[PDB]
Amino acid sequence: EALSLSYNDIKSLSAGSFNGLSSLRMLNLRVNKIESFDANTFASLKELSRLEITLNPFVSLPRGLFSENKKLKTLILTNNRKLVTLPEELLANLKELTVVNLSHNGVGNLPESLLSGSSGIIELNLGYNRLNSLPEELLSDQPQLQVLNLDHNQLESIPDYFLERNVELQTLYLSHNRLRSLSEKAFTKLKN
Amino acid sequence: TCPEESEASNCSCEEFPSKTHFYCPDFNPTLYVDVEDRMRVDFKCYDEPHDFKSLPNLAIGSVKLLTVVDCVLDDDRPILESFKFLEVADVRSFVYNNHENGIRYNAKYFEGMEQLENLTLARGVVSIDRDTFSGFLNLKRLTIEHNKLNLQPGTFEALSNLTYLGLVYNGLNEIQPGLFDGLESLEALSLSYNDIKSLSAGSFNGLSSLRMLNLRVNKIESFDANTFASLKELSRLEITLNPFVSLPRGLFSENKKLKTLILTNNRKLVTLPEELLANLKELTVVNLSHNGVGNLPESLLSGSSGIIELNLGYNRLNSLPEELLSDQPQLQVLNLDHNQLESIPDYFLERNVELQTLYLSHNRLRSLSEKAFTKLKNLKELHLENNQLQTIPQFLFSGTPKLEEIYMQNNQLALHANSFINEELSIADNDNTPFQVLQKLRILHLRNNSISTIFQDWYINNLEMQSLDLSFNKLPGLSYTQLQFQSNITLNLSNNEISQVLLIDDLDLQPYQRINVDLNHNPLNCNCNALKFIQLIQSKAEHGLQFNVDQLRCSEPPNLLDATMDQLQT
Amino acid sequence: RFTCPEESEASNCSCEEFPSKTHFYCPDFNPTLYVDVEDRMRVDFKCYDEPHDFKSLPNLAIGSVKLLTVVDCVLDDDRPILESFKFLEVADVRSFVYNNHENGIRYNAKYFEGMEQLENLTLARGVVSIDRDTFSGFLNLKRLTIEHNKLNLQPGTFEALSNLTYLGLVYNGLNEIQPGLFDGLESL
Amino acid sequence: PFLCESEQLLIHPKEELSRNNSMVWIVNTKDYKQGVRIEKCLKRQLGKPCNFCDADTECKQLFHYRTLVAVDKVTKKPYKEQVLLPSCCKCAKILS
Amino acid sequence: PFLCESEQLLIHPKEELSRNNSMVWIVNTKDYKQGVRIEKCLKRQLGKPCNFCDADTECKQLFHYRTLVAVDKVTKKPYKEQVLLPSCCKC
Ligand SMILES: *[C@@H]1O[C@H](CO)[C@@H](O[C@@H]2O[C@H](CO)[C@@H](O[C@@H]3O[C@H](CO)[C@@H](O)[C@H](O)[C@@H]3O)[C@H](O)[C@H]2NC(C)=O)[C@H](O)[C@H]1NC(C)=O
Ligand SMILES: *[C@@H]1O[C@H](CO)[C@@H](O[C@@H]2O[C@H](CO)[C@@H](O[C@@H]3O[C@H](CO)[C@@H](O)[C@H](O)[C@@H]3O)[C@H](O)[C@H]2NC(C)=O)[C@H](O)[C@H]1NC(C)=O
Ligand SMILES: *[C@@H]1O[C@H](CO)[C@@H](O[C@@H]2O[C@H](CO)[C@@H](O[C@@H]3O[C@H](CO)[C@@H](O)[C@H](O)[C@@H]3O)[C@H](O)[C@H]2NC(C)=O)[C@H](O)[C@H]1NC(C)=O
Ligand SMILES: *[C@@H]1O[C@H](CO)[C@@H](O[C@@H]2O[C@H](CO)[C@@H](O)[C@H](O)[C@H]2NC(C)=O)[C@H](O)[C@H]1NC(C)=O
Ligand SMILES: *[C@@H]1O[C@H](CO)[C@@H](O[C@@H]2O[C@H](CO)[C@@H](O)[C@H](O)[C@H]2NC(C)=O)[C@H](O)[C@H]1NC(C)=O
Ligand SMILES: *[C@@H]1O[C@H](CO)[C@@H](O[C@@H]2O[C@H](CO)[C@@H](O)[C@H](O)[C@H]2NC(C)=O)[C@H](O)[C@H]1NC(C)=O
Ligand SMILES: *[C@@H]1O[C@H](CO)[C@@H](O)[C@H](O)[C@H]1NC(C)=O
């Protein structure tokens, strides 16, 4: 029913590691030495509502990692070590994910179709990502959310068409950024 | 707020709600550092030492309560210096734990640490210097625990504002006469879990305003006659687990402000001195349980009228003096259980009137005078259980109308059906018994008694009875008459010798009234004329009577030996 | 613990002892008079049928009563009460109750000559009128109560009193509270 | 009507049982009982303040004592009994 | 403090009223003597209405049945035949 791996010395993830348990809804990884993954590692865990990975030296992720599980209510990625980039469409068509946190991940690039198809999100954080630039301007395509944090990022410009989809967005954070100017059209849709 | 530019630092901020965790060696978790919203910080070096030699700063600002756990120190350095990177300001409490390294202390350590109230060192200070605390501005509290410490006199030289100096598991072996010199305004002193050998009368010289002393674990073998003379303001003294065999006379005759005195587990203590607690008008709660006291001086409590509770349980006292309870009319709760007490002196309790509850259990009682309870107009409980009372007086409960709950479990009482309320000359509609007189009696526990009968008064005079425990009785049979309680009552007749249950079909209680009767482990005959009872058990839907009759089984009719009720065919 | 020191058959007045209360009655059959006595606190003097005299009755040594009660009993003209009840030997009394149903009389300070340390008091009936001060300022008259009396008062009749922590009137029939009747009740 | 909800109750005398007789017996003795009569309040099980009189009141249960005293036949000490029986349930005014 | 006031008495009765109605010469001999607490209602208050209330009710007097050896002078001859006796006053 519940599985957690906190302060574990395990340095790897096998796909067959988590087999023999269709009914798992909770997975916690507060600290681990894991650096490898596979999209099928969590495949068997279709009902895994929460996945939390932190303090792990993994440099990157495989495509279709969380895509297999459509029952994933929440995803947390905090204090990641040397995470240079993220796979495209990792959360594509989740349809259930409500909160995704990528805070403290050293990513230099952002994918427009990473979160596409998740019409449940209400909270999204990219804190301390330090993105050299924001390539993704089509993340508003799941406009149902209301919160956002892009603080401590090195992005030089904010795309004008980035915020044309959402109107229910309640709260926004852009501090510690490299913003020369703010778009004259992007804030006209943030009614809420 | 988490530290920006975290890329340069090895530390990682978890940015929880109202927390900010840290594990500064990010590769290997160590220095678990959090912050409770600038109210309290915390700091644990559990994994490996010296890991904070070159740590990046955290800029915490000011915080009230600091806490360091199991972290190394740099000896010649003030504490904040050793953790300069934290950048705390205005510490107001500094709890330190050091499971690993025993460090000598001195003044230098707390330089810059003033404006501090709650200091505490668990395993932190192996030995204390004479100048260590001089630097402090005002220090409301203090506490050193779980360490073997050596104390020099006057180390607390200039902690004038100190309050609740606490020593637990400190285990000092002896209090120096000048240990507390120069110390005042202590609203609390802790000597619990200490290895003290004796208490010289000068060992408490400095203290003047002390209001509470505690000796939960002490090895004190002897007191000086005036050990507690200087403690003129004292208000509470607790002694537990002390090997002293006797006390000096008039030890406490000076501490007139005293409020509560407790002595527990003095297995070597055998004889209290005369007038030990005389003339302490303030005293309100005295407990002397678990000692080895053998016999009480008659004037133990002369003039100490202010007592509310008194407790003498578990002693080895054998016989008691009436004069002891003569002038405490305020008393409320007495206790004498587990003594080898043999017989209450008849006029023992005639002075008190306020006594709520009384205890006498686990004694060798044999009998009670009618005069024993003649004056306890406000009594409301009673515990005569585990007493060898073969017989009781008929006019026992004349003077205690407010009695509620009475327990005589494991008694040797054998009042028969007749000859408890009758002399074969006068027939009584309601049996005249002491229990009959207490109308307001509700809970009763006569289990393991041999009365072997049910009294009519129990359900006539005692209208509000709620719990009856008649287990382990020799009663021959149960009759419907002997169960017309009407009021909600729990009846237990289990392990009894009952064999005949007589009912009548017209049996019906007041509406909404339900009584439960238990008849398990009884040698119940199952010949005819038990039929109506089988009907009230088998093929029973709902009524006033219930029957916890699970383990019962027919005994005597051979064709149906040991067949339970449900087994049986009418 | 008095237990009828005098022989019963001499006055026919018989009594029984118990732990609770050594009761008493004189006629010995269908008793007109009853002296209930709690061993320490209460005393109950009741004569529902008329009593012939207070001399033939024996002398029940009682030290003191934390409470006394006289019921339906004639009070002697211009005597202290205990003077009237000389046979009923009681010395120190703190409370008091009096419930004379029949033959009410006016009152005075004389009726309270030997009862000036009364914390309480009560005259449940038979109160015609209180001519002079109830107490001559007798000590610690914490409470007071006169009821069903059907009387009429005078203003400031009570002014001598000071410590009446409580005063109670029931069924007084009194038409009008005369001005200043409650004058002296400084600490009421 | 009455101020308190007092109900008459009959109590049967305690029946002597011939458990020696394993054979069944006439319930005629069980059929007729001389019994005694008592009184109790069910006014909220004797809790009513005697509503229709508004003065501060609470219904009480009252008892009566029967004193039968006989010197013993063996000329032992005189035997006196004071059996107590619930006799009435009456309402009393109370203070505040 | 009581709406109805009752004088307490001890009677030691002889020829008391009963159900059978054949109870005469009750036993109160100085050696065999039986008495019974009774609550006689005050004479003047038999019909005058209860006080401390506006109830139109009078202080009526009940009766109750007690076990006494009243049927015969010999004691235990009637097995305590029930006699009628006065009880408390209820409005
Ligand atoms: C003994 O305990 C039982 C609980 O097992 C008490 O039963 C309760 O009795 C009262 C009245 O006697 C019931 O109240 C009734 O409620 C109905 C509605 O359901 C209402 O129409 C009636 O007018 C009445 O108010 C109550 O429901 C009942 N509760 C249960 C759980 O049985 C009983 O009162 C107790 N008896 C004594 C003498 O203590
Ligand atoms: C004179 O009459 C007064 C009547 O008020 C007696 O004093 C009062 O006695 C009652 C006892 O029924 C006390 O009531 C109890 O008092 C305590 C403490 O306040 C309270 O916690 C209980 O809940 C309950 O009320 C009452 O305190 C006491 N005093 C007063 C001012 O009412 C007094 O004993 C009578 N004197 C004699 C000699 O009998
Ligand atoms: C009302 O209460 C007050 C105070 O409780 C009563 O005043 C007290 O009256 C007595 C009677 O004289 C005084 O006792 C006397 O004290 C002196 C000095 O100690 C002593 O030399 C005498 O031998 C006698 O013992 C008492 O001091 C006095 N207390 C106060 C505070 O004034 C008063 O009598 C009560 N009654 C009325 C109607 O006011
Ligand atoms: C020093 O310690 C005392 C003792 O606990 C603290 O006082 C407590 O404060 C809390 C906060 O409301 C109360 O709930 C407790 O009842 C208090 N106890 C006592 C004995 O006073 C005090 O807050 C601490 N001060 C600092 C600066 O740490
Ligand atoms: C004990 O506390 C008192 C106040 O609680 C301190 O008194 C102050 O002392 C300073 C200098 O020591 C003076 O300037 C203030 O005027 C004093 N104020 C009061 C209200 O007394 C005292 O210093 C403290 N002493 C110790 C040893 O802790
Ligand atoms: C019923 O009571 C008797 C008497 O109190 C209990 O017998 C005692 O049992 C204890 C514990 O085993 C012994 O120490 C005593 O010596 C026994 N006393 C006698 C005189 O036999 C008995 O155990 C109780 N039975 C229960 C608990 O139902
Ligand atoms: C009744 O007493 C017996 C023995 O004392 C015990 O085993 C049983 O559990 C009791 N029943 C209840 C309901 O307490």
Numbering used by the authors:
A (entry chain C): 220 to 411
B (entry chain B): 34 to 603
C (entry chain A): 32 to 219
D (entry chain D): 7 to 102
E (entry chain P): 7 to 97
Give verbatim lines from the article.
Insect Toll receptors perform critical functions in both embryogenesis and innate immunity. Toll receptors are activated by a complementary family of six cytokine-like molecules called Spaetzle (Spz). Three oligomeric states of the receptor were observed at near-atomic resolutions, suggesting that Toll5A is highly dynamic in the presence of Spz1C.
The vacated ligand binding site is occupied by another receptor chain in the 3:1 heterotrimer, illustrating the transition between homo- and heterodimerisation. The N-terminal region of Toll5A (chain B) deviates by an angle of ~60°, compared to the axis traversing chain C from N- to C-terminus.
